PDB file of C-alpha atoms and ligand atoms in Angstrom:
ATOM      1  CA  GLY A   1       0.000   0.000   0.000  1.00 30.68           C
ATOM      2  CA  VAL A   2       1.465   3.415  -1.016  1.00 29.68           C
ATOM      3  CA  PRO A   3       1.175   5.665   2.191  1.00 29.30           C
ATOM      4  CA  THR A   4      -1.019   8.773   2.136  1.00 32.95           C
ATOM      5  CA  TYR A   5      -0.525  12.062   3.803  1.00 33.27           C
ATOM      6  CA  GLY A   6      -2.724  15.019   4.456  1.00 33.96           C
ATOM      7  CA  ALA A   7      -4.178  17.225   7.213  1.00 33.61           C
ATOM      8  CA  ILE A   8      -6.968  17.692   9.657  1.00 32.33           C
ATOM      9  CA  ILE A   9      -7.501  21.412   9.595  1.00 33.19           C
ATOM     10  CA  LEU A  10      -9.482  22.895  12.497  1.00 32.69           C
ATOM     11  CA  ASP A  11     -10.723  26.442  12.961  1.00 32.87           C
ATOM     12  CA  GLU A  12      -9.936  28.726  15.831  1.00 32.06           C
ATOM     13  CA  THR A  13     -12.689  27.389  18.092  1.00 31.00           C
ATOM     14  CA  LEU A  14     -11.535  23.771  17.683  1.00 33.00           C
ATOM     15  CA  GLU A  15     -15.239  22.934  16.967  1.00 38.59           C
ATOM     16  CA  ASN A  16     -14.969  22.579  13.173  1.00 35.48           C
ATOM     17  CA  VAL A  17     -12.913  20.574  10.773  1.00 35.52           C
ATOM     18  CA  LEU A  18     -12.319  21.106   7.013  1.00 38.42           C
ATOM     19  CA  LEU A  19     -13.460  18.294   4.759  1.00 38.43           C
ATOM     20  CA  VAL A  20     -13.346  17.914   1.005  1.00 36.18           C
ATOM     21  CA  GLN A  21     -15.759  16.121  -1.301  1.00 35.76           C
ATOM     22  CA  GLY A  22     -14.472  14.179  -4.307  1.00 36.53           C
ATOM     23  CA  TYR A  23     -16.094  12.422  -7.228  1.00 33.88           C
ATOM     24  CA  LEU A  24     -16.987   8.812  -8.124  1.00 32.29           C
ATOM     25  CA  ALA A  25     -15.297   6.326  -5.785  1.00 28.93           C
ATOM     26  CA  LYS A  26     -14.274   9.399  -3.711  1.00 32.85           C
ATOM     27  CA  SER A  27     -17.763  10.910  -3.968  1.00 31.51           C
ATOM     28  CA  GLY A  28     -18.211  11.503  -0.191  1.00 32.66           C
ATOM     29  CA  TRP A  29     -16.488  13.714   2.343  1.00 37.85           C
ATOM     30  CA  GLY A  30     -12.971  13.109   3.605  1.00 36.24           C
ATOM     31  CA  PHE A  31      -9.900  14.802   4.963  1.00 39.12           C
ATOM     32  CA  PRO A  32      -7.576  16.246   2.229  1.00 39.12           C
ATOM     33  CA  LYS A  33      -4.803  13.720   1.617  1.00 40.91           C
ATOM     34  CA  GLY A  34      -3.144  11.754  -1.090  1.00 36.67           C
ATOM     35  CA  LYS A  35      -0.426   9.353  -2.106  1.00 37.16           C
ATOM     36  CA  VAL A  36       3.252   9.991  -1.440  1.00 34.73           C
ATOM     37  CA  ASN A  37       5.578  10.475  -4.496  1.00 34.79           C
ATOM     38  CA  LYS A  38       8.961   8.608  -4.822  1.00 32.19           C
ATOM     39  CA  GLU A  39      11.567  10.113  -2.478  1.00 29.00           C
ATOM     40  CA  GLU A  40       8.986  12.705  -1.061  1.00 28.85           C
ATOM     41  CA  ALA A  41       9.061  13.374   2.650  1.00 28.65           C
ATOM     42  CA  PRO A  42       5.770  12.937   4.665  1.00 28.70           C
ATOM     43  CA  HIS A  43       5.438  16.677   5.525  1.00 28.70           C
ATOM     44  CA  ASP A  44       5.998  17.684   1.923  1.00 26.19           C
ATOM     45  CA  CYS A  45       3.444  15.188   0.609  1.00 22.51           C
ATOM     46  CA  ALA A  46       0.865  16.412   3.235  1.00 22.15           C
ATOM     47  CA  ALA A  47       1.389  20.025   2.204  1.00 24.35           C
ATOM     48  CA  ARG A  48       1.269  19.259  -1.505  1.00 22.52           C
ATOM     49  CA  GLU A  49      -1.953  17.195  -1.294  1.00 21.26           C
ATOM     50  CA  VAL A  50      -3.625  19.782   0.947  1.00 25.38           C
ATOM     51  CA  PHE A  51      -2.603  22.698  -1.312  1.00 25.62           C
ATOM     52  CA  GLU A  52      -3.819  20.775  -4.448  1.00 24.25           C
ATOM     53  CA  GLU A  53      -7.160  19.921  -2.782  1.00 21.40           C
ATOM     54  CA  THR A  54      -7.895  23.149  -0.827  1.00 21.48           C
ATOM     55  CA  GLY A  55      -5.599  25.919  -2.092  1.00 21.92           C
ATOM     56  CA  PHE A  56      -4.373  26.455   1.478  1.00 19.94           C
ATOM     57  CA  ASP A  57      -0.658  26.039   2.289  1.00 21.14           C
ATOM     58  CA  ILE A  58      -0.028  24.224   5.600  1.00 17.55           C
ATOM     59  CA  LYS A  59       3.712  24.175   5.313  1.00 17.02           C
ATOM     60  CA  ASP A  60       4.432  26.902   7.867  1.00 15.27           C
ATOM     61  CA  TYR A  61       1.901  25.271  10.332  1.00 18.66           C
ATOM     62  CA  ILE A  62       2.777  21.623  10.330  1.00 20.51           C
ATOM     63  CA  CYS A  63       4.028  20.271  13.623  1.00 21.82           C
ATOM     64  CA  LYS A  64       6.105  17.118  13.202  1.00 22.42           C
ATOM     65  CA  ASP A  65       4.688  15.208  16.155  1.00 21.88           C
ATOM     66  CA  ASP A  66       1.046  16.312  15.811  1.00 22.58           C
ATOM     67  CA  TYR A  67      -0.725  13.841  13.603  1.00 19.26           C
ATOM     68  CA  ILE A  68      -3.082  10.849  13.581  1.00 18.80           C
ATOM     69  CA  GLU A  69      -2.064   7.831  11.652  1.00 19.99           C
ATOM     70  CA  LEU A  70      -4.161   4.766  10.797  1.00 17.87           C
ATOM     71  CA  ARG A  71      -3.461   1.619   8.900  1.00 14.97           C
ATOM     72  CA  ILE A  72      -6.450   0.587   6.920  1.00 13.63           C
ATOM     73  CA  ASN A  73      -6.229  -2.587   4.836  1.00 16.10           C
ATOM     74  CA  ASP A  74      -2.564  -2.464   5.020  1.00 15.02           C
ATOM     75  CA  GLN A  75      -2.260   1.145   3.748  1.00 13.65           C
ATOM     76  CA  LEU A  76      -0.973   3.770   6.089  1.00 15.48           C
ATOM     77  CA  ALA A  77      -2.763   7.272   6.231  1.00 14.09           C
ATOM     78  CA  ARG A  78      -1.223  10.035   8.271  1.00 15.32           C
ATOM     79  CA  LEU A  79      -3.016  13.369   8.811  1.00 13.35           C
ATOM     80  CA  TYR A  80      -1.174  16.213  10.348  1.00 10.94           C
ATOM     81  CA  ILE A  81      -3.261  18.185  12.837  1.00 10.99           C
ATOM     82  CA  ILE A  82      -3.500  21.915  11.886  1.00 11.75           C
ATOM     83  CA  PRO A  83      -5.571  23.939  14.436  1.00  8.91           C
ATOM     84  CA  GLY A  84      -6.573  27.554  14.400  1.00  8.14           C
ATOM     85  CA  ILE A  85      -7.182  28.213  10.754  1.00 10.48           C
ATOM     86  CA  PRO A  86      -9.841  30.976  10.475  1.00  9.73           C
ATOM     87  CA  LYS A  87     -13.204  29.968   9.193  1.00  9.75           C
ATOM     88  CA  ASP A  88     -13.203  32.811   6.710  1.00  9.68           C
ATOM     89  CA  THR A  89     -10.184  31.438   4.778  1.00  6.22           C
ATOM     90  CA  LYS A  90     -10.851  31.158   1.062  1.00  5.76           C
ATOM     91  CA  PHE A  91     -10.265  27.647   0.032  1.00  4.39           C
ATOM     92  CA  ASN A  92     -10.201  26.785  -3.666  1.00  2.80           C
ATOM     93  CA  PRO A  93      -8.984  23.519  -5.120  1.00  3.02           C
ATOM     94  CA  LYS A  94      -6.458  23.541  -7.866  1.00  3.78           C
ATOM     95  CA  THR A  95      -8.845  21.637 -10.082  1.00  2.00           C
ATOM     96  CA  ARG A  96     -12.476  21.006  -9.921  1.00  3.25           C
ATOM     97  CA  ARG A  97     -11.981  17.726 -11.838  1.00  6.52           C
ATOM     98  CA  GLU A  98     -11.066  16.090  -8.533  1.00  9.65           C
ATOM     99  CA  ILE A  99     -12.767  18.152  -5.785  1.00  9.89           C
ATOM    100  CA  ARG A 100     -16.476  18.956  -5.852  1.00 11.79           C
ATOM    101  CA  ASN A 101     -16.693  21.007  -2.733  1.00  9.43           C
ATOM    102  CA  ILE A 102     -14.879  22.055   0.446  1.00  7.45           C
ATOM    103  CA  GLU A 103     -16.749  22.702   3.658  1.00 10.84           C
ATOM    104  CA  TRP A 104     -16.400  23.105   7.368  1.00 11.48           C
ATOM    105  CA  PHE A 105     -18.124  20.512   9.590  1.00 11.07           C
ATOM    106  CA  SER A 106     -18.944  20.449  13.229  1.00 12.82           C
ATOM    107  CA  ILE A 107     -16.802  17.814  14.840  1.00 14.88           C
ATOM    108  CA  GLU A 108     -19.354  16.925  17.428  1.00 19.43           C
ATOM    109  CA  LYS A 109     -21.998  16.310  14.704  1.00 20.87           C
ATOM    110  CA  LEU A 110     -19.796  14.065  12.576  1.00 22.62           C
ATOM    111  CA  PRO A 111     -20.253  10.357  12.948  1.00 24.44           C
ATOM    112  CA  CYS A 112     -17.479   8.217  14.442  1.00 21.72           C
ATOM    113  CA  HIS A 113     -19.026   4.941  13.093  1.00 20.20           C
ATOM    114  CA  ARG A 114     -21.491   3.903  10.400  1.00 21.28           C
ATOM    115  CA  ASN A 115     -24.913   2.554  11.425  1.00 23.95           C
ATOM    116  CA  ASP A 116     -25.668  -1.140  11.062  1.00 25.97           C
ATOM    117  CA  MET A 117     -28.928  -2.453   9.510  1.00 24.49           C
ATOM    118  CA  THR A 118     -30.130  -4.407  12.613  1.00 22.16           C
ATOM    119  CA  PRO A 119     -33.606  -2.883  11.868  1.00 19.97           C
ATOM    120  CA  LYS A 120     -33.643  -4.895   8.571  1.00 18.80           C
ATOM    121  CA  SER A 121     -31.915  -8.092  10.077  1.00 16.79           C
ATOM    122  CA  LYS A 122     -29.353  -7.578   7.290  1.00 21.48           C
ATOM    123  CA  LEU A 123     -25.537  -7.721   7.748  1.00 19.96           C
ATOM    124  CA  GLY A 124     -23.270  -4.843   6.955  1.00 18.76           C
ATOM    125  CA  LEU A 125     -23.318  -1.070   7.277  1.00 19.47           C
ATOM    126  CA  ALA A 126     -25.621   1.568   5.954  1.00 18.93           C
ATOM    127  CA  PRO A 127     -24.087   4.071   3.504  1.00 17.76           C
ATOM    128  CA  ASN A 128     -22.684   7.278   4.972  1.00 15.84           C
ATOM    129  CA  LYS A 129     -21.271  10.154   3.056  1.00 18.52           C
ATOM    130  CA  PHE A 130     -18.592  10.632   5.750  1.00 21.20           C
ATOM    131  CA  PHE A 131     -17.214   7.082   5.309  1.00 21.37           C
ATOM    132  CA  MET A 132     -13.656   8.307   4.349  1.00 17.38           C
ATOM    133  CA  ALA A 133     -13.515  10.629   7.422  1.00 18.27           C
ATOM    134  CA  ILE A 134     -15.115   8.335   9.993  1.00 16.09           C
ATOM    135  CA  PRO A 135     -12.080   6.281  10.992  1.00 16.75           C
ATOM    136  CA  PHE A 136     -10.296   9.438  12.109  1.00 16.61           C
ATOM    137  CA  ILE A 137     -13.088  10.949  14.209  1.00 15.00           C
ATOM    138  CA  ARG A 138     -12.712   9.184  17.529  1.00 14.48           C
ATOM    139  CA  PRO A 139      -8.887   9.346  17.412  1.00 11.10           C
ATOM    140  CA  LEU A 140      -9.212  13.073  16.663  1.00  9.69           C
ATOM    141  CA  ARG A 141     -11.608  13.760  19.531  1.00 10.15           C
ATOM    142  CA  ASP A 142      -9.230  11.820  21.850  1.00  9.00           C
ATOM    143  CA  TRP A 143      -6.162  13.708  20.569  1.00  8.97           C
ATOM    144  CA  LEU A 144      -7.891  17.053  21.074  1.00  7.16           C
ATOM    145  CA  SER A 145      -8.955  16.139  24.703  1.00  8.98           C
ATOM    146  CA  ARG A 146      -5.430  15.107  25.581  1.00 10.04           C
ATOM    147  CA  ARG A 147      -3.590  18.052  23.864  1.00 14.69           C
ATOM    148  CA  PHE A 148      -6.126  20.815  24.863  1.00 12.78           C
ATOM    149  CA  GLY A 149      -8.709  19.752  27.495  1.00 10.25           C
TER     150      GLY A 149
HETATM  151  C1  LFG B   1     -11.535  13.738  -2.273  1.00 11.76           C
HETATM  152  C2  LFG B   1     -10.141  14.304  -2.361  1.00 11.76           C
HETATM  153  C3  LFG B   1      -9.051  13.377  -1.914  1.00 11.76           C
HETATM  154  C4  LFG B   1      -9.130  12.952  -0.472  1.00 11.76           C
HETATM  155  C5  LFG B   1     -10.039  11.741  -0.272  1.00 11.76           C
HETATM  156  N1  LFG B   1      -9.762  11.134   1.036  1.00 11.76           N
HETATM  157  C6  LFG B   1      -9.827   9.739   1.220  1.00 11.76           C
HETATM  158  N2  LFG B   1      -9.918   9.078   2.343  1.00 11.76           N
HETATM  159  N3  LFG B   1      -9.935   7.718   2.000  1.00 11.76           N
HETATM  160  C7  LFG B   1      -9.876   7.637   0.711  1.00 11.76           C
HETATM  161  C8  LFG B   1      -9.849   6.465  -0.146  1.00 11.76           C
HETATM  162  C9  LFG B   1      -8.593   6.167  -0.931  1.00 11.76           C
HETATM  163  C10 LFG B   1      -8.944   5.311   0.226  1.00 11.76           C
HETATM  164  O1  LFG B   1      -9.794   8.878   0.165  1.00 11.76           O
HETATM  165  C11 LFG B   1     -11.541  12.003  -0.396  1.00 11.76           C
HETATM  166  C12 LFG B   1     -11.990  13.358  -0.885  1.00 11.76           C
END
């Protein structure tokens, strides 16, 4: 699995996080991130992917130790945590061919799991447009509690 890098951008209240909506298999909402290039350092890949997807440069804000990393299906995803970005920042992807929309979401309102279908006695999970973000939500809330209060 080629590792991916990106960011969790939060506003100044720490309430809201910046998600991006793709197309097709990436049609839902997720954190801005993408695959590392040959010989590219993690921090540079995170900044490149975030600038390509949001038009916002995190380079001067990345902290080396402040990230959440998950291994999903034997692919590693690491999102640098970037707090205090004002909600009135103008975000604009580099190309609309990959990114449909960019929005702030309330962290407390986001799901941290998908819903089963126990009502229908059917196995599996109900669709959720936050599926790409979900795995990071509980680890984020725990990280924020520890590092802030
Ligand atoms: C569109 C822009 C690129 C970021 C993307 N984030 C994402 N999180 N998981 C995946 C799947 C590959 C496993 O993608 C979704 C939004």
